[PDB]
Design a protein around this ligand. Structure first.
Ligand SMILES: N[C@@H](CC(=O)O)C(=O)O
Lengths: 438, 438
């Protein structure tokens, strides 16, 4: 390897020792009797100091020849000094140019000249050279780890279901059709039917973090045609509140991990991520409609709360409860999927829920209808054909325990967490109505 | 929840205490003065003992009404005793029937009546109720966890790249053509182009575990049309051996985690998983051909080592080198992709490698050609058009460090690790030439 330490891995114990650093040329300052070279890596900048009387002559004349973004490797002696802005400097013994950069650059990695979002997406390798963009993708990785860790500690087993499907769905819209040899198939929009089927296997506690595809005809700042969904299904539950409690603890775990592990990144983003306050407020659909009505937003009982509604509610909850995260539950049965269990004592409402982060839905789920005959009738009530879901219904006939689960959007989770304006800021290569490349 | 403990979580410390167990009805012994009930959960069987003199009359009459595969929940007192084959029994206070099973069952959970692979695949919820099948999937989940942990411990950041692409990421044929609105697109066969682009971002050490899609015309026991690939790419390397060293340590970590944490599952499979011995032997393509020559298998230099060739070599290595795992390297440049770096001093050979497990390839990788102009020429040498790779090539123009990586098949790794006869045994819902549903 061309390096032995990253900028952040060099501490006081290494004073006076030889190390090897590598990265991109950030800045060169030829000041006559002394020269400076700044190298940038994933964690920061390293100062290479070259006093004329202390370095090799060929090295002294090589420095001013280095250009911005050239990939170089340096071996030298670590020297802790108050004179160095970051605490220490490297007195170079050997400098090697690994690869030279062309000019002009597609984007300004120094941040002076701002670039448009599409320019940044077309040149993602340049975009991440900026600390604030690198900060986002480091946090994204941390979020995925924290989530999986929580699942493991709670007895969940990771599963993997098919992305190429030829089965029926409740909506029948925004599906990406595709040919599978002689047959016609589609890309999966959710592992819903598969994770439910596995509740009849004994696995009991399952989770899957994989991509889902939806051919949305119009772009928004909240979704994309390709997303990473964090799915879970759990058996032997008594009600949907057990699922909500798990979800909030999961989300809280991810948020705290970022606060503990990525303080540097948060600081770079000039953002203060709040400490989760459990349990999050629960707001019934009825109560939500009442609050919105008083704010001028009138939604007829029975239909969905729209984009504007979520926004008004998220703001209301922040002003009245100082709650960036809260649940909406007890939705009308007519507004939710056929697989959600209705409240037996009040059939007009069901055991479904949605988790809102800063006014935007990041997750939805609920307790499912595990009783075969009732489930079949609910499919009929949706105006659908039960025979079309036979492969799925079959799993409910040979001993199916009570169960529930959720679907948590990874992009939406990170976007809302960092309070970013566009979902394209949290995924490397977005897919939308007009973007198929890179 | 209807359960507080799984069969495997009840130990000495809980003797005389109340617990709640739940699962599927395994066996009922209907006797005049006593009733025995055995229920099965994901970890095993638990005995429920109900003497007429000690249980509620209603509970006594309920037990003989239970049938095979009914889902039940039981609250009772833990009682350790030598009289119970499993060390303890539960003295029931309450029994709830959660759901009833129909007969006949799609498959036989007792293992008495064997069913063909196709029937088992058509009924996975039933199939996993058998200890030998559940064992494979618990192991699969462990392998994924071990891999991710090793990546994180070594400074690797997780990334997520597009599965819907315009440019074929691996080549001609064995590709899934799909329409992206007006544009023609394909399902990704690999994250290759994307993981390389990220090497110019400063991320340096990346990994991605996600599905890949390849349309092969013929069914075999070693491959499927949909698979999960474990990809990685690392920068600032000096040669492909640095990548091979990392890959063997990763695979070793995965094997040891299974040996250390899934001993019970291995026992159920009646399989002895060997302790990995590093470093694995490295065998050049030339030497592999020489060995095959000894065994009477003539392969003209430049050509691929076929299935038969792999078997003989794996057998030779196992029996002569005591190595169930070994690398094949220094392949003919003509036989490898345009993105692999050739040996500058001997161009007919390249810096590519393949990892063999029990005579079957589970991974391939190598050092890439990071030098822009040479790369463009290699794309031309393969009869491809450099313009079709504009987004990729642009990443090699503004400071791109030396780099390399690998693609590790998850299903192939697990199938070979457990020496299973068919790859369809390690993935829940297989996708092959004739299997599209479930
Ligand atoms: N992209 C290669 C693996 C690699 O070289 O990383 C493949 O699909 O085999």
């Amino acid at each position: 390897m061309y390096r032995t330490h990253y900028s952040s891995e060099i501490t006081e114990e290494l004073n006076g020792q030889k190390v090897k650093v590598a990265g991109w040329v950030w800045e060169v300052k030829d000041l006559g009797g002394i020269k400076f070279l700044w190298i940038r890596d994933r964690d920061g900048i390293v100062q290479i100091t070259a006093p004329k009387k202390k370095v090799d002559p060929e090295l002294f004349k090589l420095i001013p020849k280095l250009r911005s973004e050239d990939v170089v490797a340096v071996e030298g002696v670590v020297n802790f000094t108050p004179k160095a802005k970051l605490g220490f400097e490297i007195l170079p013994e050997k400098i090697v140019v690994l690869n030279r950069a062309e000019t002009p650059l597609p984007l300004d990695p120094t941040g002076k000249v701002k670039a448009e979002l599409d320019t940044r997406l077309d040149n993602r390798f340049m975009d991440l050279r900026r600390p604030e963009v690198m900060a986002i993708f480091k946090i994204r990785s941390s979020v995925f780890k924290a989530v999986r860790d929580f699942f493991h500690e709670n007895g969940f087993i990771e599963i993997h279901t098919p992305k190429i499907i030829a089965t029926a769905t409740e909506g029948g819209t925004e599906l990406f059709p595709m040919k599978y040899f002689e047959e016609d198939a589609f890309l999966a929009q959710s592992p819903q039917l598969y994770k439910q089927i596995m509740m009849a296997s004994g696995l009991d506690r399952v989770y899957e973090i994989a991509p889902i595809f939806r051919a949305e005809e119009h772009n928004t700042t909240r979704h994309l045609n390709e997303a990473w969904s964090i799915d879970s299904e759990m058996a032997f539950i008594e009600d949907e509140e057990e699922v909500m409690s798990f979800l909030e603890r999961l989300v809280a775990h991810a948020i705290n991990y970022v606060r503990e592990h990525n303080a540097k990144e948060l600081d770079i983003l000039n953002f203060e991520l709040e400490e989760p306050k459990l349990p999050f407020p629960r707001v019934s659909y009825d109560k939500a409609l009442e609050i919105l009505g008083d704010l001028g937003k009138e939604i007829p009982w029975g239909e969905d709360i729209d984009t504007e509604g979520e926004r008004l509610l998220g703001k209301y909850m922040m002003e009245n409860e100082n709650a960036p995260l809260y649940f909406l539950y007890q939705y009308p049965s007519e507004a939710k999927p056929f697989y959600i269990m209705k409240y037996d004592n009040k059939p007009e409402i069901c055991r479904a829920f949605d988790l809102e982060y800063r006014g935007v839905e990041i997750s939805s789920g609920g307790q499912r209808e595990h009783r075969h005959d009732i489930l079949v009738e609910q499919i009929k009530e949706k105006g659908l054909n039960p025979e079309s879901f036979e492969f799925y219904l079959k799993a409910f006939r040979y001993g199916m325990p009570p169960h529930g689960g959720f679907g948590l959007g990874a992009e939406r989770l990170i976007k809302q967490m960092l309070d970013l304006p566009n979902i394209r800021e949290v995924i490397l290569f977005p897919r939308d109505r007009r973007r198929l490349t890179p």
